[PDB]
Amino acid sequence: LPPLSLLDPAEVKQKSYSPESLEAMSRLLEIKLKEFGVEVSVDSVHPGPVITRFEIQPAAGVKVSRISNLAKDLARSLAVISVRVVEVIPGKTTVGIEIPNEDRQMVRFSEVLSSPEYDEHKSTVPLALGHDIGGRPIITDLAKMPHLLVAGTTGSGKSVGVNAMLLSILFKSTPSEARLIMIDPKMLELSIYEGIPHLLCPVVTDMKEAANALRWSVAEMERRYRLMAAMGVRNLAGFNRKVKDAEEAGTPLTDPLFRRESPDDEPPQLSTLPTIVVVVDEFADMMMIVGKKVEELIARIAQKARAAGIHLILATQRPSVDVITGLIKANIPTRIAFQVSSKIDSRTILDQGGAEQLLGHGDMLYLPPGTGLPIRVHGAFVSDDEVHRVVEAWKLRGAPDYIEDILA
Amino acid sequence: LPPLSLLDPAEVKQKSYSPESLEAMSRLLEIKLKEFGVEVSVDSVHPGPVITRFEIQPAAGVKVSRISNLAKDLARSLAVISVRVVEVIPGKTTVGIEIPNEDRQMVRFSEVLSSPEYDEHKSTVPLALGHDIGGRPIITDLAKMPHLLVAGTTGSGKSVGVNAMLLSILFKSTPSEARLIMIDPKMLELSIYEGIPHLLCPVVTDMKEAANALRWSVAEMERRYRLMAAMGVRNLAGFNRKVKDAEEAGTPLTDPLFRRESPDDEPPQLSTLPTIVVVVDEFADMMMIVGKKVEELIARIAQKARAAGIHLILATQRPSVDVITGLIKANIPTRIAFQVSSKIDSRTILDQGGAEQLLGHGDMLYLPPGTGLPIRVHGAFVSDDEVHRVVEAWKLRGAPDYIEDILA
Ligand SMILES: Nc1ncnc2c1ncn2[C@@H]1O[C@H](COP(=O)(O)OP(=O)(O)O)[C@@H](O)[C@H]1O
Numbered sequence: 001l002p003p004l005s006l007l008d009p010a011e012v013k014q015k016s017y018s019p020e021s022l023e024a025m026s027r028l029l030e031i032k033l034k035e036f037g038v039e040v041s042v043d044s045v046h047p048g049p050v051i052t053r054f055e056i057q058p059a060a061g062v063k064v065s066r067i068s069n070l071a072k073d074l075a076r077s078l079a080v081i082s083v084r085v086v087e088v089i090p091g092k093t094t095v096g097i098e099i100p101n102e103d104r105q106m107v108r109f110s111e112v113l114s115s116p117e118y119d120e121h122k123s124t125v126p127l128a129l130g131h132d133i134g135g136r137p138i139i140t141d142l143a144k145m146p147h148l149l150v151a152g153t154t155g156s157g158k159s160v161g162v163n164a165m166l167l168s169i170l171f172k173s174t175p176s177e178a179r180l181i182m183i184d185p186k187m188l189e190l191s192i193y194e195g196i197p198h199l200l201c202p203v204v205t206d207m208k209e210a211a212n213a214l215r216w217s218v219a220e221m222e223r224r225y226r227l228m229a230a231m232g233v234r235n236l237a238g239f240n241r242k243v244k245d246a247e248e249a250g251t252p253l254t255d256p257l258f259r260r261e262s263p264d265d266e267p268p269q270l271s272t273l274p275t276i277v278v279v280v281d282e283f284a285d286m287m288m289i290v291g292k293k294v295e296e297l298i299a300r301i302a303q304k305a306r307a308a309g310i311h312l313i314l315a316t317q318r319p320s321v322d323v324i325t326g327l328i329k330a331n332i333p334t335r336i337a338f339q340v341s342s343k344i345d346s347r348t349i350l351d352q353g354g355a356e357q358l359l360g361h362g363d364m365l366y367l368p369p370g371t372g373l374p375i376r377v378h379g380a381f382v383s384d385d386e387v388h389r390v391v392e393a394w395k396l397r398g399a400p401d402y403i404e405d406i407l408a
Numbered sequence: 409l410p411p412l413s414l415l416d417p418a419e420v421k422q423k424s425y426s427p428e429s430l431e432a433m434s435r436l437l438e439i440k441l442k443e444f445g446v447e448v449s450v451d452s453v454h455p456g457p458v459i460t461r462f463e464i465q466p467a468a469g470v471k472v473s474r475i476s477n478l479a480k481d482l483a484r485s486l487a488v489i490s491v492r493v494v495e496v497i498p499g500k501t502t503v504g505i506e507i508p509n510e511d512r513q514m515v516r517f518s519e520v521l522s523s524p525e526y527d528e529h530k531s532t533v534p535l536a537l538g539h540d541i542g543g544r545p546i547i548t549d550l551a552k553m554p555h556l557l558v559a560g561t562t563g564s565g566k567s568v569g570v571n572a573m574l575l576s577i578l579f580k581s582t583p584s585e586a587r588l589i590m591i592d593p594k595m596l597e598l599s600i601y602e603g604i605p606h607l608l609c610p611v612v613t614d615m616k617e618a619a620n621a622l623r624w625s626v627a628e629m630e631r632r633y634r635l636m637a638a639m640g641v642r643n644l645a646g647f648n649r650k651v652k653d654a655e656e657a658g659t660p661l662t663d664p665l666f667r668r669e670s671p672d673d674e675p676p677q678l679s680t681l682p683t684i685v686v687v688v689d690e691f692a693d694m695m696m697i698v699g700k701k702v703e704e705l706i707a708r709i710a711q712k713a714r715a716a717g718i719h720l721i722l723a724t725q726r727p728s729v730d731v732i733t734g735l736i737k738a739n740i741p742t743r744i745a746f747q748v749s750s751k752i753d754s755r756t757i758l759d760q761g762g763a764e765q766l767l768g769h770g771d772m773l774y775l776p777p778g779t780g781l782p783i784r785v786h787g788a789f790v791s792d793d794e795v796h797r798v799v800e801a802w803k804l805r806g807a808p809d810y811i812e813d814i815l816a
C-alpha cells in the first residue's frame with residue numbers, strides 16, 4: 001500500500017493576522033456596512049486559510065436580507081473579489097460574513113490525509129475534501145453518501161478535486177477492497193490513471209462502451225443482491241464478514257447461486273467483494289453522445305446500488321437543468337459544488353444559491369443529505385506529479401486485472 | 409512565408425489629450441452624475457485609441473447598480489453615443505466608466521502583428537484580435553480556446569474581424585502546419601480566399617457538402633486519436649515531436665495503423681500533421697439549410713477535437729437562442745462578441761450583457777474560458793486589399809492541394 005511520503009510537504013504556513021489587523025478589518029466592515037443602509041457590529045472574528053469569517057450582530061430591526069443584498073457592493077468597498085453572507089449561525093443570533101484573505105495560503109493534500117480522521121477512517125472509500133473555513137480537515141465517506149454529484153465551471157478546481165477524491169481511495173484501499181470504473185468522455189483527465197490494478201477495465205473512452213459499463217454495473221448490482229439474499233446478509237459489509245469468518249473458521253463458504261450443469265461442476269468458493277466506484281468525468285458529455293439511456297441507467301444505479309457496494313461519482317462543468325436532471329438527482333442527495341457561473345447554476349447542483357460566491361481554485365460547498373446548511377470547504381491541492389507518483393506506486397504493486405466482459 | 413510588409417502602415421497616431429482636457433472631462437463626469445442621483449469622484453483617467461476609462465470612486469453608500477442604471481442618460485448628457493460601466497476593477501474599490509473619444513483613432517492590423525507577443529508566438533494558429541482599451545495588443549491562441557463562437561450584427565465589424573483571424577494564421581503558418589476548411593453559406597465573404605494552399609478543399613458553398621466536410625472532420629479526428637493512441641502520444645503536438653525526432657534520427661516512423669492486404673503493401677511513412685481549422689462564416693445559415701445534423705456534428709467536433717488538432721471558428725449575425733444553442737455552446741467556452749442589437753442578444757453569445765454597449769467598427773468583448781470579466785478589444789482593421797494581397801502572396805508560394813474526398 002503506497003506511502004503518504006509520495007505527497008509534497010505542507011509549505012511554510014506564513015499565516016497569523018495580528019490581533020490589531022483583525023480588529024482593524026472589523027471596524028472597516030462596520031464602517032462600510034454603515035455607509036450603506038445597515039448598522040451592525042462585529043461579534044467575533046475567525047481567521048482561516050482562505051477566508052476569515054466575521055460574525056456580526058445586526059442592530060435592532062435590521063433584516064438579514066439587507067446584508068445579503070449588498071454583498072456585491074460591500075465586496076467592492078472592501079476591495080475583495082467577493083464576500084459570502086452566511087444568513088444563519090446555529091445557536092447564535094449573529095450573521096456571518098466571510099471575506100477573502102489577502103494572501104490565501106494553500107492546502108496541500110498531504111496536509112489533509114495526515115489527519116487522524118482520515119488515518120483512522122474505516123471506510124474503503126473515504127474522501128478527504130480539504131479544510132473547512134477554520135482550517136480543520138473534512139473527511140467524508142462515499143459509501144455513506146452514497147453517490148456524489150460534482151459541478152464546477154472551468155477554473156473552479158473541479159478536476160483537481162476529483163483527483164483528490166481518487167487519491168483518497170488509492171491511499172487507503174487495495175484492489176480487493178475497492179475497484180474502479182473510470183469514464184473519461186474527453187481522453188483527457190482520467191487517462192492518467194491507466195493501468196492501476198483497481199481498474200475493472202481500461203479508462204472508458206468510447207461512450208457506447210461507457211453505456212455498457214453502466215449496464216454491467218446494474219447487472220453486478222443485481223447479482224450481489226441475489227447473492228446477499230441467499231447469504232442472509234443486508235449489504236456488502238455483512239456479506240464480507242460472513243465470508244471472512246468462514247475463512248477464519250477453516251470452513252470457507254461456497255457460491256450459493258451456483259447451478260450444476262454437470263456431475264463434475266463444483267461450486268466455486270466465495271471471496272470478499274470489493275466496493276465498486278464508478279466515476280464519470282464529464283457526464284454531460286456522456287449524455288450528449290449516448291442519449292436518454294445514460295440518464296436512465298444512472299437513475300437505476302443510484303436508486304438501488306448502495307447496499308450492494310456500488311457507488312457513483314458524477315462530475316460536470318455544465319450544471320444545467322438539462323444535465324443535472326430530476327432523474328439524475330432523484331437518488332443522489334449528496335452534492336459538491338465548486339465555483340459556478342451563476343445563482344441559477346448554483347441551484348441546479350445545490351438546489352440553493354451560493355456556489356457562485358465561491359473563490360475558485362478548489363473553494364467548494366459540500367452538501368450532505370438532509371436539511372442543514374452546506375459546508376464550505378477549501379479543496380486540497382494535488383499536483384499532477386503527486387498523482388503520477390501514486391499511480392506508478394500502484395502500478396508497481398500489481399498489474400491491471402481487467403474483465404473485458406464489462407465493456408462489451 | 410509572406411512578409412508583414414504587405415500590410416498598410418500605422419497611420420499618424422494624432423492622439424494625446426492634454427492633461428487639462430482629461431481633467432475637464434473628469435469634472436464634467438462628476439457634475440453630470442451629480443445632476444442625477446449619484447455623487448462620485450474621478451480617481452484616475454486612462455485614455456486609449458477608442459475610449460477613455462475614468463475610474464471613479466463612488467461616495468459612501470452609493471450602489472454600483474445606480475451608476476449602471478443611468479448609462480443611457482449619462483451618455484446623452486455627455487453627447488456620446490453610449491457609455492460602458494465596468495462594475496468591478498480588480499483590487500481597487502473603484503468603478504469604471506468608459507467614454508467614447510471624440511476622435512477614434514484606428515487600429516491597423518500591421519500595428520498588431522508587429523507586437524512581440526505575436527512575433528514570438530509558438531502556436532500554429534494564433535489570433536491577433538486588436539488592442540485593449542489601453543492600446544496594448546491582444547494576441548490569443550485558437551488551439552487553447554479550443555474553439556470559438558463569434559457573433560455580431562451587420563455593421564459591427566465581424567467580417568473584418570474574421571479576416572483578421574484568418575490573416576493571423578496565414579502570416580505565421582505554412583500549409584503543412586495549418587490547414588483550412590472554409591464554409592461560406594453566402595458565396596460572399598470567404599470566397600476571396602479561394603486557392604490558397606492551406607485549403608483542404610474549395611471554399612464550401614453547397615451546404616450539403618459543408619455537412620460532409622463536418623463529417624469528414626469527425627472522421628479525421630477519430631483517425632488521429634487512433635493514431636496517437638498507437639504512438640503513445642497525448643496530442644497533435646506530441647505526435648509531431650515523435651515523428652520529427654524520428655526523422656532527425658534518420659529512422660523515420662511508419663504508420664502503425666497500416667493493414668497489409670498484400671505481401672507487397674509497404675507501410676507508408678509518417679509525416680507531421682497540420683492543425684486543422686474549420687471556419688463557418690454564417691453557421692445560422694448552414695443550420696437553416698441543412699438541419700439538426702449541423703448542430704449535432706458541431707457538438708461532436710467541439711467535444712473531442714482539441715487534442716487531435718482540429719479547431720472550430722463559428723460566426724453569425726443572428727445571435728439567438730435558436731442559433732447559439734446549448735448543444736453548440738456545450739463545449740465552445742471561448743466567445744467573441746462584436747456589437748449586437750440587445751442585452752438579450754449579448755447574453756445569447758456571452759451569457760452576459762454588455763455586447764449591446766459596444767461601439768461597432770470592430771469594438772468587441774472577448775470572453776476566454778472560466779470566470780473572469782470579458783476583455784474589451786478594439787479590433788484591428790484589415791482592408792480587402794490587405795487580404796487580397798496576402799492571398800496572392802500565398803497563391804504564388806504554392807498551389808491548392810485539395811482532398812476531393814472531403815466534400816463527398
Ligand atoms: N485546491 C486547490 N488549491 C490551490 N489551487 C488549486 C486548487 N485546485 C485547483 N487549483 C489551481 O487551479 C488550476 C485549475 O484547476 P482544475 O482542477 O484543472 O480546474 P477545472 O478542471 O475545473 O477547470 C490548477 O492549475 C491549479 O493551479
Ligand SMILES: Nc1ncnc2c1ncn2[C@@H]1O[C@H](COP(=O)(O)OP(=O)(O)O)[C@@H](O)[C@H]1O
Binds near residue numbers: 566567568771787790
Ligand atoms: N476594426 C475596425 N476598425 C475600423 N473600422 C472597421 C473595423 N472593422 C470594420 N470596420 C468598418 O466597418 C465596415 C463594416 O465591417 P464588416 O466587418 O463588413 O461588418 P459586418 O460584416 O459585421 O457587417 C467596414 O466597411 C469598415 O469601414
